[PDB]
Design an enzyme around this catalytic site. Structure first.
Site, short mmCIF file in Angstrom:
data_model
loop_
_atom_site.label_atom_id
_atom_site.label_comp_id
_atom_site.label_asym_id
_atom_site.label_seq_id
_atom_site.Cartn_x
_atom_site.Cartn_y
_atom_site.Cartn_z
CG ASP A 1 25.48 29.54 38.23
OD1 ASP A 1 24.30 29.98 38.15
OD2 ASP A 1 26.15 29.78 39.25
NE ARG B 1 13.87 35.12 36.75
CZ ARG B 1 13.74 34.26 37.76
NH1 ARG B 1 12.85 33.27 37.73
NH2 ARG B 1 14.50 34.40 38.83
CG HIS C 1 23.91 29.08 41.73
ND1 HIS C 1 23.50 30.31 41.24
CD2 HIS C 1 24.16 29.25 43.05
CE1 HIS C 1 23.46 31.17 42.24
NE2 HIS C 1 23.86 30.56 43.35
CG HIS D 1 20.57 31.08 38.97
ND1 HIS D 1 21.74 31.78 38.79
CD2 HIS D 1 19.65 31.67 38.16
CE1 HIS D 1 21.52 32.77 37.93
NE2 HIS D 1 20.27 32.70 37.52
CG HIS E 1 21.42 31.67 34.55
ND1 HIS E 1 20.94 32.93 34.81
CD2 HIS E 1 22.74 31.83 34.28
CE1 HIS E 1 21.91 33.81 34.70
NE2 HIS E 1 23.01 33.17 34.36
CG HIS F 1 18.77 36.05 32.60
ND1 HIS F 1 17.85 36.63 33.43
CD2 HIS F 1 19.09 34.85 33.17
CE1 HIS F 1 17.61 35.83 34.46
NE2 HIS F 1 18.37 34.76 34.34
CG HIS G 1 16.06 30.31 36.77
ND1 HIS G 1 15.79 31.49 37.42
CD2 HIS G 1 17.12 30.56 35.95
CE1 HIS G 1 16.58 32.44 36.94
NE2 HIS G 1 17.40 31.89 36.06
CG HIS H 1 25.71 33.41 39.78
ND1 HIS H 1 24.96 32.58 38.97
CD2 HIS H 1 26.30 34.30 38.96
CE1 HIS H 1 25.08 32.98 37.71
NE2 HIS H 1 25.91 34.01 37.68
CU LIG Z 1 19.06 33.23 35.74
ZN LIG Z 2 23.57 31.20 39.49
#
Ligand SMILES: [Cu+2]
Ligand SMILES: [Zn+2]
Ligand SMILES: [Cu+2]
Ligand SMILES: [Zn+2]
Lengths: 153, 153
Positions: free
Chosen positions: A83, A143, A80, A63, A46, A120, A48, A71
């Site tokens: 995403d 993370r 997002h 995000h 993702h 992740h 961030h 999401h």
């Molecule tokens: Cu994330």
């Molecule tokens: Zn997201």
């Protein structure tokens, strides 16, 4: 921008290099590269919001979400900007990443330059997990590695 | 932008955190923070062109210079956009940086978001060294620590 790059590093064995390229100030962004050190299977991937590494990957924030949506997966209308779904690691712990996305951008309002890319601990359920966390992070968990997205030659 | 941050890290003991804030597009950029682990004295402090950490600080490339000018100090007309001059470390090895600059920007053609901030081994001679290298890097020597300049909350 045209070319960007991000070096993912963390406190564990996960490390990688992810490139981004956008031929046109409007369009599709090609994202590719490699990540190693991962457990075989799906991992959330993702963008961030903050390119702030002062407290490792935690300071990257949630995000990137300039449209204030929930999401989802990269193919959902509801998602997002940041995403990008999952990437897949093989039995050697290696994820060969190749994604094309037309929601993130290297220019304009959806620009991700200066923001943070995160890989992740676990699979992103793409917003279908049945709880609040799913609607925020896809339940992707911790993370493992991140980097600030920067301008490349 | 209003607010950006950079975490400086390298192969040795130099590390720090530097903040950048700009209130008007125009507009002057305040730069401030702490860098520790330095030899007492003057160290070159520049924004380099690429936010590319693939090979440490080496891959950040040369000084950000969209006007194709020669190297200078921040007070010079003739300077690269990335030329922030020197920062000074005290006898504890701590540089408490506080600079104001209206050549760098957090937007437009001189935007430094996604580029790399570097702190150097030696003093920047501000383009007064009398050799070719002076007009490029200021003879500031090796790159002790760097980081990608990222969007902060
Ligand atoms: Cu994330
Ligand atoms: Zn997201
Ligand atoms: Cu330099
Ligand atoms: Zn310079």
């Amino acid at each position: 921008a045209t070319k960007v790059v991000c070096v993912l590093k963390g406190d564990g064995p996960v490390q990688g290099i992810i490139n981004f390229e956008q031929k046109e100030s409007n369009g599709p962004v090609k994202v590719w590269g490699s990540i190693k050190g991962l457990t075989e299977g799906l991992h959330g991937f993702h963008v961030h919001e903050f390119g702030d590494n002062t407290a490792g990957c935690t300071s990257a924030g949630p995000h990137f979400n300039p449209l204030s949506r929930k999401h989802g997966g990269p193919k959902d209308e509801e998602r997002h900007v940041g995403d990008l779904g999952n990437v897949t690691a093989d039995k050697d712990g290696v994820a060969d990443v190749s994604i094309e996305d037309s929601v993130i951008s290297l220019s304009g309002d959806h620009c991700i330059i200066g923001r943070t890319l995160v890989v992740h601990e676990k699979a992103d359920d793409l917003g279908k997990g049945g709880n609040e966390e799913s609607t925020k992070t896809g339940n992707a968990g911790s993370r493992l590695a991140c980097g600030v997205i920067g301008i490349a030659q």
